Structure 1
């Protein structure tokens, strides 16, 4: 009926549990579209994906597709204002982003459901009439340069690019996609290159509709969205641009049978094994790479990892298919290395080849495939509802590779068993086709080459033919066996009827000296899943640095020992997490409820009757020592946040204290620790999901009985159940703690204005001021003043106390940052004074909607409940109570609050700043007038600082 529509796709295959409605169609200009109708959604979204990226970049400008990614969303003929799209989405509780890959430039946003047409109209105009405003040319270069400079000191980005540089330089795969100040400014200036004209050349030659895909999600019907997208996207130019393909592999003979020795930033030992393979995409209905990745990357009994671990060579492994570009892919086998693993690289690889050879001897297995196909079927069926912004962005890219009807089922379903394709792929995984890379600090001052884009230090060798022959002739290994029938595969998906005694919030169904049990039966999602949360309290887990180290190692060793068993459950959508806390231990079991008690039983049984293997203990003790030293390689803002937590909490063991006390951790001392730690405990739990009241009680009893029987567990005294207090800062006080980051040449800062103890009134005073200043903070400090890559503002909540926080990572000294934040606070006071009641009520309403936002998955609901339980505040109806009080708030109340608590001259001001210096550092112009800042009290000793100040009380519970 409509000439603007080429074809309306048939039924879009979806999960029976999916209530969202789908319509697929192709427009006359060649745009592939998917319309998502969700009358339930709080946020409406859209995405456009151009099948052009950084592999198409011109030789003259490296990072041009990525620079276009920035320059395209700056002004349009309909909306000449550069920041229109950004402002509209900010004004209507939205957000936007984009990314550039080698073959795609994806653009996306979300907005309040009532404003889809307005946001989409602004979005569509960039694909119709862009202007590329010459005024933002230099700031975008700096935004792209800031992105790369952040990546430069990242080990993964370094490796990613070093791999690209060690392939065929004549191949597009070797291109540097990010760009920088050099590639976008310095170099084009020297060569008399017109950056804007080269950008427009690129835009006009590649950005065509035939290579585009659109996804629109909203409350509006399928037909209303069909009209909206036709109106907005049938006018987009169709220059019939051919799809860029790369059939030739960037890895030719001279790039095979090669060995690379790389120097990292962090003290990490890793082995990377790669095989170039053809492009397997077209075989998505059988997916041979997934079959082989499942087996090679298996962690159960008889796996390659198991043997490599037993040999004491590796702890972790990753195996499978890795995307390349249209025409090529890679097969990887990635492992970490123990000190002995680094010495037995050749041996490890021999074992890798022995496992690959076992699969050849055994041949493909239909039963392994049946499990994989059946599991993905259950996965797709009971899958959680997606965040619309990520959902659209994802589908936009997927539309290019699959028929309209298969874009939901694409990466989930398996149909045909193709053992011939498995045999085809497995045949490329051979020693004459291997590329080997070792990453070790031991290569420092022993390297001859440099990757210039990042500065990575490496050496390259050709692998001796005698090493290749040993891998080819590799003898059989009986330790390697194919996995067994996965008994963890779920079968019972019955949604237990909603009980007569069912409550809207978690109810305390057990209250004893040993345990406090909070339970809720899911009354919203109705998926066969549940979340089991346990917090085990012991004063012996943080009494001193030694015991803290021992509580860490205990649980690392426990997860390691349970790994081979737990893996099968993980594959069957049942996962667990076990971490030590500053009060004891945390256990979470998520996923399908069916086989959930079995894994829980095993976890607690292992906990209570743990037999430590000396070899594992020594390997894990070494890796934890490295992990301690590796904190220095973390970013300055991350360090700043770590120092404030130390400073502000009553008891807190530093990384320096923990590593000093690690040497004293012996195997008998640890063997003595476990019964002592488990001798006396309090357990506080939350069991939420597809469970009944009597089932939750039986779970808790099983947990109790296992600890009582095997560990001889007894409860703790209520006087022993004590939490740490926050430091109480003095009125009109300002303290500064300074430290240096030795890895990065940027500064870090956290500015904390401590207000008072949390309450309905105090929370909403702070949250309203935070709501008001939120967007301006980013546009001022980040966009206008260009302070740093990281600019953050919001409430800080710790130990029942709260306040206002500012986190910034800049190239400018922390003391300059101090004066800028202070000027901004004055501007915000002016803004609140000057703003209208209409603009003020919009803030109260924006915050109110965010706080009343319904959780969209069970885990999101449980996380809200868990927060109230771990804070011991138990205010499950918080949002309603606090939103009712917020609506009564006046402009003058926030002005008074600022005047008394936050202002430079406020009578009750409590400012504490943490300054993290850059690697090389030492300690008008139409900008806001910064006030006069007093002399800070410089903190020299964390203990003396705490000893000289009072500590706050602890917040009283609701229940």
Structure 2
């Protein structure tokens, strides 16, 4: 069925990838991506037969088929063979299934597309779905359900799927566990495999593909190479799975629901099933809804609710649904005092609806957000070869081949009818209410079938109905104003005399230190900024750390309602604290980061306090403190890891106790004492000059001395924390008991050495050569537990080696199998040939040598050196040049004194994180009391 129809494609002229769409006569839509500049080529295939076309008795038949359609052909019937061919050419494929799609996508090393096409063609001629791949892949799907046990959003999602019409095919179960996929059909004698063959043969083989290939080959060779190759798909005219009715048919409308959550949250969830705008993608009022409903601005609803203290956060907007119907969701966070006023919150919601009803549609919002679509559509930076092709193949089904790239970022018409229409869909007739609160006890009986969440209707009384009906009024509400942060500075400045691949010290004082580099590679109008604010007062107490948290948090939170317009313009930022000081990040365009950032410095320099806001944030961090008894035991192990291996550390227990005495006058007194004398360090990167960067820095510290009279710090009180020396041979351990999880954790740590050129290679190559056999033996073969991790630990200028495994075991028993794996790797050193060595050092080589893809990525790497103050900018080529000087026999010399069991320089320490039910380590103070301390690193 070799059919092709195409022409010139509107291709958003920043990309150079020339495009062409065509449709094959067996229901295969073909979009051609030609990138002769890509390192890795990619391809994607979306079948519009989704998981709504599954049989009602067997869950995840399309899910298990798109898992199983890879493995087993008449060419290659072996179990991992297709995947082993993707292990040859470095490609990491994945595929998925939705209600209206079942989608495939894959990449490849450089040009080996054909090889995967040869592995791919006999999927349509003869899919096999054999015994063993099936019986392990069902364990993979059951593990997928097992890891989605504790994700409550899928529980509530399925709760939306099941509390509609349970007869409607929307109400089916998407993934399917062990029990539904293979326990119930074969006890009913239904072969899952014959269903697979039926499903693929009738449904998949017929029609509804949407293929797209990111190839490097040409426009034409891959074209008449794959067009010709797909006539094995034969049209049978299977109809498109659509729904002519929504499952919400007034049984669950004008209804309340009360949900008991697994996580300690407070939420209210409102859903509106709404008619189709799939034909109305052109004007697309749902984008207008997402702009207007979730705006946080002058006279907005969230501004008043923060001013009323009822709402912490919200999200709302259009949720897509079936071909016929669509959804409209509202998901808000709840405070304490929202509980008596829940209905009043809903009243304010109807007030905002009436505010939109009062002023009707708006046109300058439509044209302005259209222009924002224009700007963001042009200034698309790059594209991932994975995921992008799966997305545009997702919309290749619904959109013409020239409209796939102008997907939603261009708007033709203005539809005040549709906007008023969905406002007519926002009425008390149309409301669904789902309340998320922990307090629901003994009262929510009706339990979910698959996962088990529990709810109750408690239909709305008439007082609230009539209050919903009559009260369509205005309160605070105003329409929001135009943003002011729109840039015009898009002009790339050519590189000057500062022609460096690494940021140079353009300014150093005793107050500041300023490193700078322009965008050599990426050539973007944006710029990224990193800031170190050093302070003595940071980790003096639990109290001061609490004051750092609360201060920075409520501080950033204050001008956040103003910041919504800043993030609305495309300018992101970060405020962070450290044990050493404060961290500031500024990312975005060149426009008003001086103006706005100066306004930020002036804001946090001279700042005021609300009384009850202070109490809520106080309680909130108190909540996070009480929360700290309940998290995942690997986080618990990393907490002890970074606890013991620093110089001083305040525990979360005494942090929890210390909030009994944190008063507002004490903080408010501390702040100018804090700000009186401190150090600032800054990294600047992007489309600017050096002298303008000097003027911005001069602005910033001028502002600082102007408001709070910042003085520099003494280079004897410019300190870092060291790391604990051990007596070179001991293996010490202790235990900690978990409360929540029945699994036990454990972590083993190695004091190797500073980051020298030798030790980086030693540790990286030894870790990577024990990385994949650990995956093969320990997790795959030994099946100890799902959370098994190994690897490095770079801290305080000292390398380290760490291992994270949680399971329910005796910990010394678990250590015994760890040591068994250590002996296995120990002999596997001696089992290394030259070839294993060479392929591994090539693996390490490509692991190390990889260009950045973002200014923030390389700024994060450089900043990661700056926080260690090392500046060894060409450690990459130095260490790689060193890497070729290593042998296998070298690492025995690394193994024997440092790593072996008889090793005299073995620096080994373990920590047990026991389930819910050497020498011991009783006192961490007495631990550090008679141990030496490491020296620090000479900075390059």
TM-score, normalized by length of structure 2?
A: 0.95
Partner Cα distance (1:910, 1:228) in 2: 59
Partner Cα distance (2:116, 2:863) in 1: 36
- The structure-2 alpha-carbon separation of the partners of 1:600 and 1:767, relative to structure 1 and needing over 3 Å to count, comes to same
Asked if the contact 2:155/2:451 (under 8 Å) is kept, the reply is yes
User: Are residue 321 (structure 1) and residue 310 (structure 2) matched?
Assistant: no
Moved more, 665-674 or 106-115: 106-115
- The structure-2 alpha-carbon separation of the partners of 1:404 and 1:323, relative to structure 1 and needing over 3 Å to count, comes to same
- Note the C-alpha offset of 1:812: 5.5
Q: Deviations over 1:18-53 (max 9, x none)?
A: 233333332343222333333333332222222233
User: Are residue 811 (structure 1) and residue 793 (structure 2) matched?
Assistant: no
Asked if the contact 1:90/1:775 (under 8 Å) is kept, the reply is no
Q: Deviations over 1:811-838 (max 9, x none)?
A: 6565554344433343334444334323
- The structure-2 alpha-carbon separation of the partners of 1:46 and 1:365, relative to structure 1 and needing over 3 Å to count, comes to same
Match of 1:891 among 888, 892, 897: 888
Secondary structure, counterpart of 2:628 in structure 1: helix
Asked if the contact 1:208/1:241 (under 8 Å) is kept, the reply is no
- The structure-2 alpha-carbon separation of the partners of 1:748 and 1:863, relative to structure 1 and needing over 3 Å to count, comes to same
Moved more, 14-23 or 505-514: 14-23
Asked if the contact 1:23/1:34 (under 8 Å) is kept, the reply is yes
- Note the C-alpha offset of 1:948: 4.2
- Note the C-alpha offset of 1:500: 2.9
Partner Cα distance (1:913, 1:231) in 2: 60
Asked if the contact 1:732/1:905 (under 8 Å) is kept, the reply is no
Moved more, 335-344 or 494-503: 494-503
Asked if the contact 1:272/1:334 (under 8 Å) is kept, the reply is yes
Q: Deviations over 1:461-494 (max 9, x none)?
A: 2112331221222252241111101111222211
Partner Cα distance (1:623, 1:139) in 2: 45
Moved more, 424-433 or 91-100: 91-100
Match of 2:284 among 283, 287, 292: 287
Partner Cα distance (2:231, 2:746) in 1: 49
- Note the C-alpha offset of 1:810: 4.1
- The structure-2 alpha-carbon separation of the partners of 1:449 and 1:298, relative to structure 1 and needing over 3 Å to count, comes to same
Moved more, 699-708 or 50-59: 50-59
Asked if the contact 2:351/2:475 (under 8 Å) is kept, the reply is no
Q: Deviations over 1:554-581 (max 9, x none)?
A: 1111222111111111111111111211
Q: Deviations over 1:406-429 (max 9, x none)?
A: 222214333322222211222101
- Note the C-alpha offset of 1:64: 2.6
Asked if the contact 1:98/1:107 (under 8 Å) is kept, the reply is yes
Partner Cα distance (1:215, 1:669) in 2: 63
User: Are residue 938 (structure 1) and residue 920 (structure 2) matched?
Assistant: yes
- The structure-2 alpha-carbon separation of the partners of 1:752 and 1:129, relative to structure 1 and needing over 3 Å to count, comes to farther
Q: Deviations over 1:134-175 (max 9, x none)?
A: 123333222222222222222322222222222211122322
Partner Cα distance (1:42, 1:530) in 2: 26
Asked if the contact 1:608/1:710 (under 8 Å) is kept, the reply is yes
- Note the C-alpha offset of 1:623: 2.0
Partner Cα distance (2:52, 2:745) in 1: 35
Asked if the contact 2:507/2:515 (under 8 Å) is kept, the reply is yes
Aligned position for 1:771: 768
Partner Cα distance (1:679, 1:361) in 2: 51
Match of 1:57 among 54, 67, 72: 54
Asked if the contact 2:129/2:196 (under 8 Å) is kept, the reply is no
- The structure-2 alpha-carbon separation of the partners of 1:22 and 1:681, relative to structure 1 and needing over 3 Å to count, comes to farther
- The structure-2 alpha-carbon separation of the partners of 1:413 and 1:820, relative to structure 1 and needing over 3 Å to count, comes to farther
User: Are residue 640 (structure 1) and residue 622 (structure 2) matched?
Assistant: no
Moved more, 654-663 or 726-735: 726-735
Asked if the contact 1:542/1:583 (under 8 Å) is kept, the reply is yes
Q: CA RMSD in A?
A: 2.4
Partner Cα distance (1:890, 1:950) in 2: 34
Q: Deviations over 1:108-129 (max 9, x none)?
A: 3334325443345435554553
Asked if the contact 1:262/1:440 (under 8 Å) is kept, the reply is yes
Moved more, 365-374 or 76-85: 76-85
- The structure-2 alpha-carbon separation of the partners of 1:141 and 1:808, relative to structure 1 and needing over 3 Å to count, comes to farther
Q: Deviations over 1:715-774 (max 9, x none)?
A: 111222212223334434333343344334444443333322111110011111223233
- The structure-2 alpha-carbon separation of the partners of 1:899 and 1:500, relative to structure 1 and needing over 3 Å to count, comes to same
- The structure-2 alpha-carbon separation of the partners of 1:412 and 1:884, relative to structure 1 and needing over 3 Å to count, comes to farther
Partner Cα distance (2:96, 2:749) in 1: 33
Q: Deviations over 1:331-354 (max 9, x none)?
A: 222221111123321111110110
- The structure-2 alpha-carbon separation of the partners of 1:345 and 1:237, relative to structure 1 and needing over 3 Å to count, comes to same
Moved more, 829-838 or 677-686: 829-838
Partner Cα distance (1:940, 1:306) in 2: 51
Q: Deviations over 1:630-664 (max 9, x none)?
A: 34443333332223222222233333232222232
Moved more, 946-955 or 680-689: 946-955
Partner Cα distance (1:713, 1:639) in 2: 38
- The structure-2 alpha-carbon separation of the partners of 1:951 and 1:17, relative to structure 1 and needing over 3 Å to count, comes to farther
Match of 1:269 among 263, 266, 269: 266
- The structure-2 alpha-carbon separation of the partners of 1:571 and 1:656, relative to structure 1 and needing over 3 Å to count, comes to same
Partner Cα distance (2:441, 2:937) in 1: 52
Partner Cα distance (1:160, 1:631) in 2: 28
Match of 2:45 among 45, 48, 60: 48
- The structure-2 alpha-carbon separation of the partners of 1:225 and 1:660, relative to structure 1 and needing over 3 Å to count, comes to farther
Secondary structure, counterpart of 1:447 in structure 2: coil
- The structure-2 alpha-carbon separation of the partners of 1:141 and 1:730, relative to structure 1 and needing over 3 Å to count, comes to farther
- The structure-2 alpha-carbon separation of the partners of 1:501 and 1:549, relative to structure 1 and needing over 3 Å to count, comes to same
In structure 2, stretches of 5+ residues that fail to align are none
Secondary structure, counterpart of 1:863 in structure 2: helix
Secondary structure, counterpart of 2:251 in structure 1: helix
- Note the C-alpha offset of 1:917: 4.2
Aligned position for 2:516: 519
- The structure-2 alpha-carbon separation of the partners of 1:832 and 1:147, relative to structure 1 and needing over 3 Å to count, comes to same
Partner Cα distance (1:783, 1:51) in 2: 34
Partner Cα distance (1:443, 1:657) in 2: 32
Partner Cα distance (1:123, 1:916) in 2: 47
User: Are residue 606 (structure 1) and residue 597 (structure 2) matched?
Assistant: no
Partner Cα distance (1:223, 1:895) in 2: 54
